[PDB]
Design a protein around this ligand. Structure first.
Ligand code: NA
Lengths: 247, 247
């Protein structure tokens, strides 16, 4: 069975004190043995975050990295420096980077191949805009973004896909569980045609976009929804309730 | 007179072991009483670097930051998070960001205004390419880049300017101290016309080309060269010789 996966994207938020609060809560509150939790703080706090974790269910991820490990790339993060301080994952292709930071499908693909090759897992984000959805192109869009990665990446063992409707980000407007389920099923079937049935059956496809403590349990029986990429709620006590939503 | 300023841009290079050797070496080194040294490691190592610093003349800086302090900006660094960990500076407008990551002139200006308003110093990078130099565009380029910042910020008390002869990178040209002095003098004179004579006479203008332990001394008597923004030599023992180059 696909292990339930809950990622926490802090985005540009946090401090040493607030993150110490977040990690101590995870360390001391009841969470399942049967869960894979990955908290993704700002790069400034990756080292400190890893240093605080006291549950094996919880590891730390970066929110972005470059497609080279070293060199004259002032301002970038490196998967090697992520590993050096003990983190194990990176988010690649978040809509905020695709939209505001010029990261096209191929850049995301090249970064994904590179990260995986350096032994870092990838939380790969995909998702359609409200105009694209209204146009009926949700599947065409996520297939396109996935196709770019499929071009470069043959082995998805250490990839987790985060499907995030762009209009669902920061607006409080979550996809319905039925809709996310139908979409995840479609995505899984498309990936089966490329990666094969077994790989598609093992790949976690997460839902992201206004996921929170109240609505996480509404997704509990959606078979193709394997977890969440949590945004704002990952900074809050209810992140624990999301983690336990399939308890 | 203007205080000698030496910044060390690590770029995408470093590990916790490098950081320890580099900072402990600075801690016990004999350097001038009044030099101002800023080491700028990957964001991943900002926290750890500040924790190891004991030299009063040494502070820690980031290599880039966004133009807001918090929010839904996955993958970015924040000046408030830089401050939280005890760092004090940020490099903005490095040629590697202007080129590879499409950071436009106003983007740099908006970041500069924002960082200074948050109480973080700015190492403001400017510089023209080989193509621009060969077209006689050197001052048009730097004045454009500086004008964009001046549109947003006129109090440059907490700014140092780093001139990068991008035209000397890999091109088979070398920028000489004489070249540095001439361009710096022109830059200072332009900025006097915008900021006033007193501000311009206090502003540090750093040579941000290839400087090392061997050649840093050849800039020692150039009146308008007030220090360095050093690249690869930041990670090496000779970073100390650069700091001591005007003894
Ligand atoms: Na997210």
């Amino acid at each position: 069975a696909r292990t339930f996966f809950v990622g926490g994207n802090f985005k540009l938020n946090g401090s040493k004190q607030s993150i110490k609060e977040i990690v101590e809560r995870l360390n001391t509150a009841s969470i399942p043995e049967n869960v894979e939790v990955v908290i993704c703080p700002p790069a400034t706090y990756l080292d400190y975050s890893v240093s605080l974790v006291k549950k094996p269910q919880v590891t730390v991820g970066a929110q972005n990295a470059y497609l080279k490990a070293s060199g004259a790339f002032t301002g970038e993060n490196s998967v090697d420096q992520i590993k050096d301080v003990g983190a194990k994952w990176v988010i690649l292709g978040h809509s905020e980077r695709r939209s505001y930071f010029h990261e096209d499908d191929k850049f995301i693909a090249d970064k994904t191949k590179f990260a995986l090759g350096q032994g870092v897992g990838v939380i790969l984000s995909i998702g359609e805009t409200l105009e694209e959805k209204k146009a009926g192109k949700t599947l065409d869009v996520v297939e396109r973004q996935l196709n770019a990665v499929l071009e470069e990446v043959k082995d998805w063992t250490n990839v987790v896909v985060a499907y995030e409707p762009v209009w669902a980000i920061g607006t409080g407007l979550a996809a319905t569980p039925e809709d996310a389920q139908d979409i995840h099923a479609s995505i899984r079937k498309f990936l089966a045609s490329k990666l094969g049935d077994k790989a598609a059956s093992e790949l976690r496809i997460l839902y992201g976009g206004s996921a929170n403590g109240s609505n996480a349990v509404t997704f509990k029986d959606k078979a193709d929804v394997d977890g969440f990429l949590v945004g704002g709620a990952s900074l809050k006590p209810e992140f624990v309730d999301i983690i336990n939503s399939r308890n």
